[PDB]
Each structure stands twice: as C-alpha cells, then as structure tokens.
C-alpha cells in the first residue's frame, strides 16, 4: 500500500517535501479548498510525487447552487492541472437553522433521498468520481452508516474514502463493530488513518483530533485485516493537523509501512 500525508497548512511545506525526498510518503493528500486562490501549477511543482484532493468546506449538502458551481468550476481546473489520484469530500452537518456548528454533526442517515440528490449534483460539478468519507460517530447513527454508504455508492457511482480511525471511534462510542465496513474496505482502494483523543470530561468517548499517534485498537484493526485493506492501487493517508512535529509523524508512518510491506 502507498502511504500518504495530508497537506493542510502552508507552514508545513518544508517538512512534507523532506518526507517525499526521504521516501517516507508516496503521495500528498491536500485540503484543496484551502488553496483555491493560488496558481494550480505552482502547487503541483511543490511536490515531487502524485497528489490527492480532499474537500472540507464545500458544504454541498447545503450550499447554494450558484456559489457551489463557482467552487466546482475552480476545482475542475485544479483537477485538470494536477490529475489527482482521487477527489474526496465529506457527509457532514454544518448548519442548524442558520447557526454554524463548531463541532460538525453527523447527518441523519434516514435522509437518503436528500443526500443522494445533493451528492449526484456535487459529483457532476467536479466532473470526476467522488469519494465520500465516513463520520467518527458519537451517537447511534454509526449502526446505520455502513449500509447508507453502500447504498449511496451503489446508486450514484461515488466511492467511499474509508477512515479507519473514524470507524474505530464509532466502535468505541456506540459499539458498532468496524467489521460492518468490511465490504466497503474490500472495495475502495483509498483510506484514512490518524490518532484520536478523548472527550475532556469523559475518557470513554473518543473524538477525532488528528493530534496523536495511532491508538492500539486502530493498529490492530489495520493489522488483522491487512488482506482486506491491501489491494492493487491501494492508498492510506496519515492525518495530522495538530501537534505537527517530524518525529511523532515519522514513527506512525513507519508503523504504517510495517503493517503493509511490499509483496
């Protein structure tokens, strides 16, 4: 499997380029909506490796079609210039009755017809195959999410960007076994993984913080299912957007290649 790292902040470029030079990562996944105003060639010339796109604040489930189309048209020529390995987005609840959520909410999976319509519209604007990431659930919506993505991916042609750390959070928070995602894991070739924290007032509830090394159950999840994960063209992106130092990322990347060695 190929190992990737997420490029989110402009101040981390020098370290990500060093990771590429030392063959520590095979590609760079990007928060491409953060860099929508810089030249798309300069940013392709910044990484001597393939890149991937990760869209965070499109809000395609709720954004107005006029502003959504303008973003898609801009992202379309970023796709043309850089040819990302995949383009991925989220399924997230951003706004409730006009107020912005600072901790983004898990959408109600009973609203399939609405999500399906907005997904096909957003995937059309991007002009490529879209991958959707799963939520690190806290409430009981984790139990009906695996079949929700399998249905959405079947009817709209989207792929699933499976975050192993997020499903591990869901298993710890609601009991929903990560083995519910087995069929999705054996289909999609692109994955996410990161460390997670705990709710301040409760060490039992887990939250995706992307600020630590990988947990013990997250590593055992990837290890005992290395066959279902590993595939031709398979990729996994280590995410670390907080506490970004070279050495805590170095060990986690080495533990990642230790699970998935070449043939």
């Amino acid at each position: 499997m190929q190992i990737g790292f997420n490029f989110t902040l402009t101040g981390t470029l020098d370290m990500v380029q060093q990771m590429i030079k030392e063959r520590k990562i095979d590609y760079v996944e990007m928060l491409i909506d953060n860099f929508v105003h810089l030249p798309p060639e300069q940013i392709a010339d910044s990484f001597d490796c393939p890149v991937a796109f990760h869209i965070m604040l499109s809000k395609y489930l709720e954004r107005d079609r006029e502003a959504l189309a303008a973003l898609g048209k801009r992202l379309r020529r970023f796709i043309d210039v850089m040819r990302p390995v995949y383009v991925s987005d989220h399924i997230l609840y951003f706004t409730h009755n006009g107020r912005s959520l600072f901790h983004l909410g898990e959408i109600d999976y009973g609203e399939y017809d609405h999500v399906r319509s907005k997904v096909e519209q957003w995937q059309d604007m991007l002009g490529t195959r879209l991958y959707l990431e799963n939520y690190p659930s806290i409430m009981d919506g984790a139990w009906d999410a695996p079949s929700f993505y399998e249905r959405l991916s079947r009817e709209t042609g989207v792929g699933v960007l499976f975050d192993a750390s997020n499903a591990i959070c869901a298993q710890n928070n609601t009991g929903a076994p990560v083995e519910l995602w087995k069929k999705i894991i054996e289909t999609t070739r692109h994955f996410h993984v990161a460390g997670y924290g705990t709710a301040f007032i409760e060490p039992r509830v887990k939250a995706d913080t992307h600020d630590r090394e990988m947990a013990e159950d997250t590593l055992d999840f990837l290890s005992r299912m290395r066959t279902s994960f590993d595939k031709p063209g398979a990729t996994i992106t280590y995410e670390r957007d907080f506490d970004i130092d070279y050495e805590s990322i170095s060990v986690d990347l080495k533990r990642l290649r230790d699970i998935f060695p070449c043939v």
């Binding site: 860099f35 810089l38 006009g98 600072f102 009981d140 039992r204 509830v205």
Partner: protein, 194 residues
Amino acid sequence: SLLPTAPVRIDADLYDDLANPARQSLYPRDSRGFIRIDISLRAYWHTLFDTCPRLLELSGPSGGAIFLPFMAWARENNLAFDWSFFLWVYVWLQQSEFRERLDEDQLLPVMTASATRWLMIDRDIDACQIVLGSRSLAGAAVVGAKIDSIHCRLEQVQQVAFAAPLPLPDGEFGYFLTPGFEIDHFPGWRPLPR
C-alpha cells in the same frame, strides 16, 4: 460500559442544543447526549478563548462570566456563529460589566481572529480579501487575505494604514470585500452579519 443515549438516539436529535449551555442540564449526566453537547460546547469555548486568550483576563481562567451570558445573548439575537463570531463577543463586552476594561489590547486580537476565521471558512471564489473596520480603530483596518502563493513568508492577516482616512462605520464594526488582492476603492462599510 457504553454510555446510554438515554432520551435521544442520533446527532440530529441534539442539533438544537449543541450551542445552548443552559439546555445541557436537561440531559442525564450519565447519558451520551450530555457528553455530545459538552464536546460541542467546548468547541465554542476553545475557538473563542484559545484564539483570544486575553479575554480570559476579563472573565477569569474558566471564562464562564463571558461564555454563558454571551451564548444566551447570541441565541436571543439569533447569531449565526459565522466569521463575525469574535466581533460579536466584543460587541457584547461593550454592554457588559467588563466595558470599562476594554482597550486596544483586547480589540485587536478579536479583530484579527474574525479576519482569520473568514480566511479559513469562506469559499467565495470572487472574494480575495476582507477588510475590517472599527470605531475604536480610526485610520487603520484589519485586512484578511486568502492564500495566493504557497511560499509567502507573511501572515495572511495584517493591520494596514490608510492615507486618505476611512469614515468610521455606523456600528462598532464594519466590513467590505475586495475582488482581488488590492485595495483601490472604498465601497462603503457593510454592517456586521449574523
């Protein structure tokens, strides 16, 4: 071992109380809905006080004397918790018991925090910079500029000085957006959004 979801089931059941600290008491402490709100409530707390640590000089380390009355004040005035979130805290401070202790050492960090927030969340292709003005900041303004180069060694938020002076806004704050990365025209201060 799992915490009970007691009176609810999914996140969509708690949407309305995710920013209402006064409504957290009606959930069982041992319940998962109480913790979900606490996680969301701490997200508002840390977004406000990690970005503007000097506000804790007014309220104290817990920040409760600012946080709880503002969250109630924002629900009444139907605030949207957008990029103007920090600036609305400052507006509330001007009518609060801390109004006598408001100086530029408190006004500036919340102004660059709102400019920084608009920088990270706004997705208008046709909007490159935001310009923040204040009646407590004559002759200058806070400009937030989106990234247009991966190699810029500067901050994306700067305090800039205007040769010909800008009229002070009607309310305490005012803003306008520029089509590009240059300010060659003053279009008029727009009122602060919700």
